[PDB]
Amino acid sequence: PFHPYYTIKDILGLVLLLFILTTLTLLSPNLLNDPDNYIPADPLNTPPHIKPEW
Amino acid sequence: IGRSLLTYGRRIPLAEWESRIAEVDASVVREICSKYIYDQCPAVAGYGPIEQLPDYNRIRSGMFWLRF
Numbered sequence: 850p851f852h853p854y855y856t857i858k859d860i861l862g863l864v865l866l867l868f869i870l871t872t873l874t875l876l877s878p879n880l881l882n883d884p885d886n887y888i889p890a891d892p893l894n895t896p897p898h899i900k901p902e903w
Numbered sequence: 904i905g906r907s908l909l910t911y912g913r914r915i916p917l918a919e920w921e922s923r924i925a926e927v928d929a930s931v932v933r934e935i936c937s938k939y940i941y942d943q944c945p946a947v948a949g950y951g952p953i954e955q956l957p958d959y960n961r962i963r964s965g966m967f968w969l970r971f
């Protein structure tokens with residue numbers, strides 16, 4: 850049966866995901882960040898180096 | 904007679920049994936049932952088409968109430 854086995858197993862998985870998410874949010878927030886999106890939009894100039902989200 | 908002299912060392916007369924029965928009351932039942940049944944691990948045996956016999960964890964969790 851799904852309960853109790855996979856209930857606790859998925860809860861463990863969620864705890865792990867939250868640990869990773871917190872470390873990414875507080876300890877190293879700029880790891881995946883892109884500087885070129887901290888410049889507001891300019892319809893007359895495309896920047897030389899273009900790169901979407903990963 | 905035989906079984907009694909082996910187990911008890913003595914014959915227990917019906918009068919003594921009656922006196923012992925008269926002392927039980929709902930409070931005694933509550934107490935002693937709690938003393939032997941409540942939140943205990945059981946022994947289980949099954950024979951037959953027993954696919955639907957609950958899992959052991961599900962049976963163990965049935966030995967206590969969350970609302971108590």
Ligand SMILES: CCCCCCCCCCCCCCCCCC(=O)OC[C@H](COP(=O)([O-])OCC(O)COP(=O)([O-])OC[C@@H](COC(=O)CCCCCCCCCCCCCCCCC)OC(=O)CCCCCCCCCCCCCCCCC)OC(=O)CCCCCCCCCCCCCCCCC
Nearest residue numbers: 852855856857858859860863961964965967968969970971
């Ligand atoms: C989000 C992310 C999602 C993705 C995540 C991904 C990963 C997920 C992985 C995990 C997945 C898990 C899946 C679920 C597994 C479920 C397993 C299961 O059901 O097992 C069945 C399990 C197996 O037993 P069984 O074989 O079925 O045998 C049945 C027997 O009857 C057994 O009899 P028993 O006596 O042993 O147990 C019966 C009793 C056992 O429980 C109890 O007696 C109490 C348990 C502990 C205390 C909890 C009290 C909560 C009270 C409500 C909230 C108020 C708190 C105080 C604050 C007041 C504020 C004014 O439980 C009940 O009767 C059920 C209800 C218990 C609560 C009573 C209140 C009901 C109304 C709820 C809504 C209230 C809204 C308004 C609130 C006020 C205004 C804000 O038995 C159950 O019945 C389990 C009960 C589980 C109850 C869970 C309650 C959760 C909700 C709480 C309230 C939420 C709202 C809060 C609002 C804000 C105010 C605080």
Ligand SMILES: CCCCCCCC/C=C\CCCCCCCC(=O)OC[C@H](COP(=O)(O)OCCN)OC(=O)CCCCCCC/C=C/CCCCCCCC
Nearest residue numbers: 852853856857860863864867961963964965966967968969
């Ligand atoms: C917000 C970030 C939090 C980060 C930290 C980690 C979060 C995740 C942690 C795990 C959360 C688990 C939630 C789901 C409930 C899991 C229950 C569990 O594993 O135990 C099973 C067990 C079922 O009992 P059995 O033994 O199987 O049956 C007995 C039958 N006689 O669950 C229970 O205890 C059910 C009874 C209810 C327990 C309490 C449920 C949660 C709510 C309680 C607090 C109420 C106030 C909530 C307020 C929230 C804010 C407004």
